[PDB]
Paper text:
Here, we present a cryo-EM structure of RalGAP that reveals an extended 58 nm tetrameric architecture comprising two heterodimers of the RalGAPα and RalGAPβ subunits. Already at the initial steps of image processing, it became evident that the 58 nm elongated particles consist of two identical subcomplexes, which are, however, flexibly linked to each other. The resolution of the focused maps was 4.4 Å at the hinge region between the two “half-mustaches”, 3.8 Å for the central region of the RGα2/RGβ heterodimer, and 3.9 Å for the peripheral region at the tip of the complex. However, the reconstruction includes a portion of a second RGβ subunit of the adjacent “half-mustache”, which allowed us to unambiguously model the N-terminal portion of the second RGβ subunit and a small part of the second RGα2 subunit. Interestingly, between β4 and αA of both RGα2 and RGβ SD domains, large loop regions with little secondary structure except for two helical segments are inserted. These loops reach over from RGα2 to RGβ and from RGβ to RGα2, respectively, thereby linking the subunits with each other and accounting for one-third of the heterodimer interface (buried surface RGα2-RGβ: 10,443 Å2, RGα2-RGβhug: 3923 Å2, RGα2hug-RGβ: 3574 Å2).
The two RalGAP complexes, RalGAP1 and RalGAP2, act as GAPs (GTPase activating proteins) that limit Ral-GTP levels by promoting hydrolytic activity. They comprise one of the catalytic α-subunits RalGAPα1 (RGα1) in the RalGAP1 complex or RalGAPα2 (RGα2) in the RalGAP2 complex, and a common regulatory β-subunit (RGβ)11–13. The GAP domain of RGβ lacks the catalytic asparagine residue and is thus not active, but RalGAP complexes require the conserved asparagine of the GAP domain of the RGα subunits for activity. The RalGAP (GTPase activating protein) complexes are negative regulators of the Ral GTPases and thus crucial components that counteract oncogenic Ras signaling.
Residue numbers in the entry:
A (entry chain C): 17 to 65
B (entry chain B): 17 to 356, 428 to 461, 507 to 657
Amino acid sequence: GHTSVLHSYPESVGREVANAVVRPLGQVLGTPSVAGSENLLKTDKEVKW
Amino acid sequence: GHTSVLHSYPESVGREVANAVVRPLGQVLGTPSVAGSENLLKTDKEVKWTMEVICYGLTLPLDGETVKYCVDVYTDWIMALVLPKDSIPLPVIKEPNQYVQTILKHLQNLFVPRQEQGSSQIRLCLQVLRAIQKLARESSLMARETWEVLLLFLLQINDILLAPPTVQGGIAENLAEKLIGVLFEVWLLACTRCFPTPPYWKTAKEMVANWRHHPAVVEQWSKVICALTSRLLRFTYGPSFPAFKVPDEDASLIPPEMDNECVAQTWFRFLHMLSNPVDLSNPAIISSTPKFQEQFLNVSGMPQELNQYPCLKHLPQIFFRAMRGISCLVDAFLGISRPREPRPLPAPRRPKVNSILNLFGSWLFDAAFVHCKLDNYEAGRAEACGTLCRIFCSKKTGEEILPAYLSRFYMLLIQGLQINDYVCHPVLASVILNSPPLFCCDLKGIDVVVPYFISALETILPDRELSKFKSYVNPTELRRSSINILLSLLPLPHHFGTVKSEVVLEGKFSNDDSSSYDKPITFLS
């Protein structure tokens, strides 16, 4: 179960995708604020992706 | 269902991840000279992830080759239905229907017009259109659900690219012909085998009524209905009946696999597919679509935008083209295959005049009278009784005609033949030219309109060169028709003499100024 979907693709584009997709999540999680943005994910497909 | 999962993320990061995914995958699958390479997709989760990430890429602007790779891999993937390819992943071949349905759902976002990349957008759109066209033309066996999805996708993209008002230099102007042609071709192919359900017919009829301001729509409809009616009359009567002429390409639009019984239903449904062509005469009705109403909210400039839109200047030509098409259809039904140049004699196997009136005359009568009440759409009005005027003269001898049709035709003839102030040269010339044997066909009560014809001829025969009519019809042919009409009325006085002729005084219709309107005029005068 530890296998990754992005493994088949080249490593450079894989790491580009990884950083580009995790940077906004890390920014949102850090520096908590009173305002509620309703997170970013809403449905099962989004959280699965 | 076409919304991409990646839309939640900000635009910049989404563009970056889409480009990063599409660069190697596109450069491998889309680019040629990649035979023998193992597929990068092996599992259903893999292919679903890839499909979603590629689907988000369409919304991105066409800058760079990312959109080119996306459309190329889409065209390669959709071609898997026609024939399997090495680059196609194995799970795609295993379950093709659902995957191609999802791809077609994703392709809807591509056709959305963009800001300034139309130079490449036109090429990409035509490539996708021809890819789908060849996909459906040589399609393998597939479930009717895929056909329904394809038809809905075509209707949706046509609605996206046609409903808004036409702006000069836009993509819609250059792509309307291709869109309508591919829509009609795919619809005919679907009716060949699937025969889509009545709800789809209703949806198409409702959607197509909003694209009547594009000149290509009426032309394509006319061509396809001419092909269908030629195919129908090819077997409705038999080889004895004259064959309707039709271009080879238009005859090739319909496939020969259709059985005789199925042709009638699709012919009727396509004949009524477009709304009443008389609607094109009214400019307010055309400029009342829901998109136009939404556009009317954005309308804040000239107050005459209800009748001065950029795309409302082509209405007279579109109406004339529709009237020409319906006139050609009526001529094919009647037996006058050639134009009007001599006109061949009507075939002995032609249907009764009342049936032709029931089938077509309602549209013809409405089109004639709507411009009778209205020099803007004169060509359509002239063609209207071109057709009508010609229909009645082809009646078989001793054939009964329903009196309502005769009354309507007589009213039309009275309205057309006016000289005082309500004179229109094209319709008058058409009425005179189209009906030489009008009086000779022993029409019941035709003698009532005799004084109007006498008054009309007094303003054409004494004229030397017919300057007013020389820009619409050939003066020599018009003179010949006038002579034929006059020569058929000379025996009437001496034959009748003192017999009174009824007068119909419903307003300022009579041309005489003798203050004897309430008096049946005898032929002696």
